[PDB]
């Protein structure tokens with residue numbers, strides 16, 4: 001229960017939101033297919049209510065009994081159908097977890113991460129927090145921001161606890177499953193012993209983490225250190241680098257001064273150095289006082305990759321290498337080529353001739369690239385991994401987790417091939433550029449293949465590709481959703497698990513070992 005003044009404020013604010021902000025500022029102008037929910041949400045992209053744990057899911061084929069863990073997958077799932085204006089990325093975070101051990105699928109569960117934002121929107125039964133891309137990047141964006149801060153002025157909303165949406169991927173670090181938020185602190189999620197998922201709360205690393213960090217921090221296989229970047233779009237140092245030890249101890253911040261505020265979705269790691277991608281997509285907040293998006297692509301700016309020693313004391317140790325006209329949203333892997341002293345970076349990029357309208361137009365390519373950096377000389381190299389015969393769109397993917405920052409010959413990646421739909425996944429030979437596809441079959445689509453390495457006793461440390469791929473699939477002429485189990489080495493289906501409900505499309509997934517799960521403690 002609110003007030004009597006403020007109860008009557010909220011009433012009037014709602015009426016204003018609808019009769020003015022919506023009806024005057026918004027409804028008379030169309031809605032780009034990139035903020036239009038009928039597009040963004042349509043089909044299997046559409047959200048799904050929580051399934052509390054369902055046990056002994058029906059399995060065909062033979063799940064290898066040695067496999068023992070949880071496959072967990074984050075993604076966007078707007079609790080309430082959004083009032084106009086919404087991009088696929090804007091939605092509430094939801095995790096799907098499937099317990100696997102002894103040839104069994106012990107439990108499927110799916111749950112929202114209980115974000116300060118959702119907790120408040122549940123209270124009212126309505127969206128109230130503005131959509132970041134779909135509302136705030138629009139022309140009404142400023143008005144929308146005012147409507148919110150007006151409501152917040154009447155104690156009707158509280159941004160004070162962060163307004164992140166925790167939908168952009170997961171890591172398992174020092175016994176905690178963390179739900180990654182682009183513009184907020186991580187949320188701690190407890191994988192429950194019954195198979196369920198409970199949101200512990202908003203995680204700042206024991207007092208240490210004060211700002212928002214990027215949603216792709218990298219965990220070194222050897223050191224157990226978790227390496228992170230944070231960018232602040234406002235104050236002087238627009239980019240920090242720091243890490244955490246297994247002791248959960250935080251390093252001193254290494255400031256990376258940049259000329260302007262650069263958006264940085266992802267970065268990469270090597271044995272001894274971090275690889276930061278400084279690209280052309282940039283923050284010009286000015287734009288928003290005009291009808292414009294604050295996220296601009298700066299044609300003028302020169303794309304580059306910084307190489308910085310992991311235990312650096314000062315920014316002066318950073319080595320900037322120009323790679324003109326390259327943007328990559330994700331960097332699968334990077335490694336130190338000892339034979340050259342070069343740094344090899346494997347990711348997937350687009351070479352933008354693009355203008356202002358970022359998406360309402362045509363021809364979006366996204367190409368698996370080998371980028372070679374030679375820090376001392378500053379000259380670089382950029383080639384497509386696949387020959388122009390079997391050039392195929394290869395989206396979100398993974399390299400063997402244990403070989404992170406070391407040289408890997410195989411990558412596994414989404415075959416986005418009726419563009420945004422994923423018809424399969426491919427095993428890639430990053431040296432030779434050969435591939436084999438696993439076709440999902442007619443009318444069936446997925447996303448991020450999760451490679452699980454058969455933890456050990458093969459050679460001694462196993463062969464690079466002695467593992468398994470786990471992907472959710474989704475049948476059209478739709479029955480339910482399955483999770484396949486494919487043998488990474490001979491790229492062959494072995495087990496097929498049916499999920500009770502429907503697993504909607506998602507973002508980054510991860511695999512927690514059984515014995516990894518043991519450390520949980522919360």
Ligand SMILES: [Fe+2]
Nearest residue numbers: 216265330508
């Ligand atoms: Fe990502």
Ligand SMILES: [O-]
Nearest residue numbers: 168169215508
């Ligand atoms: O992400």
